[PDB]
Amino acid sequence: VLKKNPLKNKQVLLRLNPYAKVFAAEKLGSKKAEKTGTKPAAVFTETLKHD
Amino acid sequence: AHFKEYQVIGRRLPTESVPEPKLFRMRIFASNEVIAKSRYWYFLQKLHKVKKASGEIVSINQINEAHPTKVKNFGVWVRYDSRSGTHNMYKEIRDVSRVAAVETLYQDMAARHRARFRSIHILKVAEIEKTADVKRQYVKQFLTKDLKFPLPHRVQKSTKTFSYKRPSTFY
Amino acid sequence: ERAARKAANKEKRAIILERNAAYQKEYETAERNIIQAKRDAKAAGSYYVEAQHKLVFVVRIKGINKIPPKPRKVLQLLRLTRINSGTFVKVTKATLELLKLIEPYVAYGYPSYSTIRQLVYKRGFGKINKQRVPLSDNAIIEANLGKYGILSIDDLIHEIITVGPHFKQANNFLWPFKLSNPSGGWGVPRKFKHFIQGGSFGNREEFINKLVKSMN
Amino acid sequence: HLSTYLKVYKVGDIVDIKANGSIQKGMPHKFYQGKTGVVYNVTKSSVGVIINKMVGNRYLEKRLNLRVEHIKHSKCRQEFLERVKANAAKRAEAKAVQLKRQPAQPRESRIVSTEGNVPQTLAP
Amino acid sequence: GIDHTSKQHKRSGHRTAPKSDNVYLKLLVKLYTFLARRTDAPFNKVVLKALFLSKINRPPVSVSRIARALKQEGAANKTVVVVGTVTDDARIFEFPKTTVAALRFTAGARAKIVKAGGECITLDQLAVRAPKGQNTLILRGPRN
RNA sequence: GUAAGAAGUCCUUGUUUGAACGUGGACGAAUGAAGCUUUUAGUGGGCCAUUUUUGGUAAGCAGAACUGGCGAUGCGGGAUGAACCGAACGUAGAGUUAAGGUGCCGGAAUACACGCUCAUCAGACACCACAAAAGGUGUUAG
RNA sequence: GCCCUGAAAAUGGAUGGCGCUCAAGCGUGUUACCUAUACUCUACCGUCAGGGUUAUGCCCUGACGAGUAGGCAGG
Incomplete structure (x- = not known):
């Protein structure tokens, strides 16, 4: 009789998409990335900056 | 709006007969990437025989000033x-x-x-x-x-409507 | 008998949760791999180009009066029957010609997973023979589009964004999205120029997410 | 052009009408020019051709006789038959797909290299 | 605005009820509405559609037409059905012993059928005999 | 103009050196969503606008070909206005906007920023649309 | 590029008026804001369609509502 909206009302959110529970547990949106240090090329920075 | 500098590169699309074409680069001043790419194709159509359907952009990038x-x-x-x-x-x-x-x-x-x-x-x-x-x-x-100079007329922005002071513009 | 009902529900629910976890893994590893490919090209001194977008979202911008017949018919075909109504479309040459025709009267672009999810959750309405039925439950989708293996609203979002074999059927099941006018406004004073000339219509390619998030 | 006479035309084949100026006999049909029709009967001297001509808003059926000099084999169904045979082959291979056609798709990701092709910057 | 495409507020026609005022006919359609709704048989929907028809579109059907229908192969013992009216025919001399159901029989036609041996029946009795229309043969009269 | 398939493809031999019919076996680009009669009102050389094109001269303009709108149509704006901009209408409420606007009349910044301009009746949409081709020891940037 | 002139009469007169001069004018850019019978949400009325049910009625669901000549229906 009345449309209730997910993105509010965690109950009707959880009626659908039950992955949301563990999603919020692991938090999965403030998730950190594996660090790397792949430096770029001299030709790349050169042709970016000029000529 | 407040402009930005964008590096753009274009590839005009490969063919048989011609793999890896010549990668023309340009520097654009523009608000965002959409306008930058439109200007890129606008200048490239004037310089060479390319088209947005006949070509493609390779690497859009931003250029920040080295000493801003x-x-x-x-x-x-x-x-x-x-x-x-x-x-x-x-x-x-x-x-x-x-x-x-x-x-x-x-x-x-x-x-x-x-x-x-x-x-x-x-x-x-x-x-x-x-x-x-x-x-x-x-x-x-x-x-x-040793450059110096004054600002002789100061006029002060007033937040109110009325003032009780007979204001002064000095410095 | 009620225990049998609950057992079937529990089975389908576990299926949904493993499917959704798989889809999350797919999306994150895909974007991470694209990023690492860009970085690898940069490190090797080569350039990496991303795949051209295959899905676009389109929004109507102009009313119904004094519209010429060809764009009127094309908007009928794309189910943009009124102002601010919107639809997803799969982009090929055949559709690009239509978009070229209806550029003055629509704003379109390349949407994000976040806005697709928000649209399908808040304004997601479905067609059950007719009628614009609100979704409200995964059963309504498992009935109609369980033929195509789409048992959940998230499976539908996946078939939409990852354009699948049955994108046509899922999108036609989806009623045209009814949207409001943006809360922050349109920005520009005058709408009916291109996005480039300080207008609003035409392709903007990423800010459609901002626009539809203001409008939804 | 003698190759316009060693041309078998069996009932069922589709042909375009393009009448050449070099033969005053049987110059047909002022606006039946570049129009296609299948052949219904053949005699000597002769081939039959039928065309769906529209009058008002219905397609009526006009059957006609023409000299062989004006008619020409149609390459209308070349890709159709090629695709049908290739579809049979692909269906056999599947039995061992998207055999349907598809429009031009968006080109996918790739990598562009800089080995001897450094990008050449320029201006107006 | 909406820029419509289908000429909104269509009526669909199709005569949901009869123009008549015959209370007995209204009992008949009240019965066949239940039957066509609950049975799933198509025969009952056909009969209900035919009951709404007018006199111009319910032509009479003759004894001779019925005998033609019964001369068909494997169709002699079927219960023939005319929703309209059934007339006599003095052109045929031999008539089967069939069962037939209809709204209205004429006196001569009823007499001929009874004389050959069969019976004349109403649609409600046809319903309590054969709800789904099992082993039935519907006939219609020449329209023009 | 035609074509984009199950009224289509591929094996099976009786009737003019072979064609047609017939016998039986194996299997298709995108998007979006019915047909048949029957019968009768009112209107059936009226007004406006755009762009195609023929002929044009003091200037205007006259003929045809689409399209859109008014006629029948209220609403917001343009101070006011049949055909300009937006947008088409059930009765109410809350929110967001369009076009146009935010010194006072008048709801909304006498907001922010960069420049230019002083007119003895400046200007406050322009249109190498008219006055029109220039003139000027007024000013600014090239 | 802006400014002056670059001809136009006759009741008193109009950037709409007041009036405005680092503007309340011209050009441009960045934000905020006002605001329609337009868009979104909800309720109610009516029509239409689809369903259900021992009653030209009862129930569920949804989409729609401009109107002259004129037509049909219910009162």
Whole structure:
């Protein structure tokens, strides 16, 4: 009789998409990335900056 | 809006007979990547035989100023296909960044010539390393030793409607 | 008998949760791998280009009066029957010609997973023979489009964004999205120029997310 | 052009009408020019051709006789038959797909290299 | 605005009820509405559609037409059905012993059928005999 | 103009050196969503606008070909206005906007920023649309 | 590029008026804001369609509502 909206009302959110529970547990949106240090090329920075 | 500098590269699409074509690069002043890419194709159609369907862009990137706090004297080449065949202009702008120079240039052209973004073409913005290569007098005005000057009329912004003071503009 | 009902529900629910976890893994590893490919090209001194977008979202911008017949018919075909109504479309040459025709009267672009999810959750309405039925439950989708293996609203979002074999059927099941006017406004003073000329219509390619998030 | 006479035309084949100026006999049909019709009967001297001509808003059926000099084999169904045979082959291979056609798709990701092709910057 | 495409507020026609005022006919359609709704048989929907028809579109059907229908192969013992009216025919001399159901029989036609041996029946009795229309043969009269 | 398939493809031999019919076996680009009669009102050389094109001269303009709108149509704006901009209407409420606007009349910044301009009746949409081709020891930037 | 002139009469007169001069004018850019019978949400009325049910009625669901000549229906 009345449309209730997910993105509010965690109950009707959880009626659908039950992955949301563990999603919020692991938090999965403030998730950190594996660090790397792949430096770029001299030709790349050169042709970016000029000529 | 507040402009940005964008590096753009175009590949015009490979064929059999011709793998790996020649990757033409350009520097654009524009608000965002959409306008930057449109301007890229607009200049590339003039220079060479390419098309947005006949070509592709490889790497859109941003260029930030290496020293955006160091004050600089830029010289700018400009041209605009009006009213005659195209004719050029050299202007000088004292500012910190190429972005600010281009912004105040567009505003100055709109003011002093009624010439518009659609009408204007940027050829080359270039920092002038050495003094005595500065040609224009309104920029030469500001390079003198131990420069000082006042602001003799101060008028104070008032938040209220009424004042009980008979205000003063001093300094 | 009620225990049998609950057992079937529990089975389908576990299926949904493993499917959704798989989809999350797919999306994150895909974007991470694209990023690392860009970085690898940069490190090797080569350039990496991303795949051209295959899905676009389109929004109507102009009313119904004094519309010429060809764009009127094309908007009928794309189910943009009124102002601010919107639809997803798969982009090929055949559709690009339509978009070229209806550029003055629509704003379109390349949407994000976040806005697709928000649209399908808040304004997601479905067609059950007719009628614009609100979704409200995964059963309504498992009935109609369980033929195509789409048992959940997230499976539907996946078939939409990852354009699948049955994108046509899922999108036609989806009623045209009814949207409001943006809360922050349109920005520009005058709408009916291109996005490039300080207008609003035409392709903007990423800011459609901002626009539809203001409008939804 | 003698190759316009060693041309078998069996009932069922589709042909375009393009009448050449070099033969005053049987120059047909002012606007039946570049129009296609299948052949219904053949005699000597002769081939039959039928065309769906529209009058008002219905397609009526006009049957006609023409000299062989004006008619020409149609390459209308070349890709159709090629695709049908290739579809049979692909269906056999499947039995061992998207055999349907598809429009031009968006080109996918790739990598562009800089080995001897450094990008050449320029301006107006 | 909406820029409609389908000429909103269509009526669909199709005669949901009869123009008549015969209470007995209204009992008949009240019965066949239940039957066509609950049975799933198509025969009952056909009969209900035919009951709404007018006199112009319910032509009479003759004894001779019925005998033609019964001369068909494997169709002699079927319960023939005419929703309209059934007339006599003095052109045929031999008539089967069939069962037939209809709204209205004429006196001569009823007499001929009874004389051959069969019976004349109403649609409600046809319903309590064969709800789904099992082993039935519907006939219609020439329209023009 | 035609074509984009199950009224289509591929094996099976009786009737003019072979064609047609017939026998039986194996299997298709995108998007979006019915047909048949029957019968009768009112209107059936009226007004406006755009762009295609023929002929045009003091200037205007006259003929045809689409399209859109008014006629029948209220609402917001343009100070006011049949055909300009937006947008088409059930009765109410809350929110967001369009076009147009935010010194006072008048709801909304006498907001921010860069320049230019002083007119002895400046200007406050222009249109190498008219006055029109220039003149001026007024000013600014090239 | 802006400014002056670049001819136009006759009741008193109009950037709409007041009036405005680093503007309340011209050009351009960045934000905020006002605001329609337009868009979104909800309720109610009516129509239409689809369903259900021992009653030209009862129930569920949804989409729609401009109107002259004129037509049909219910009162």
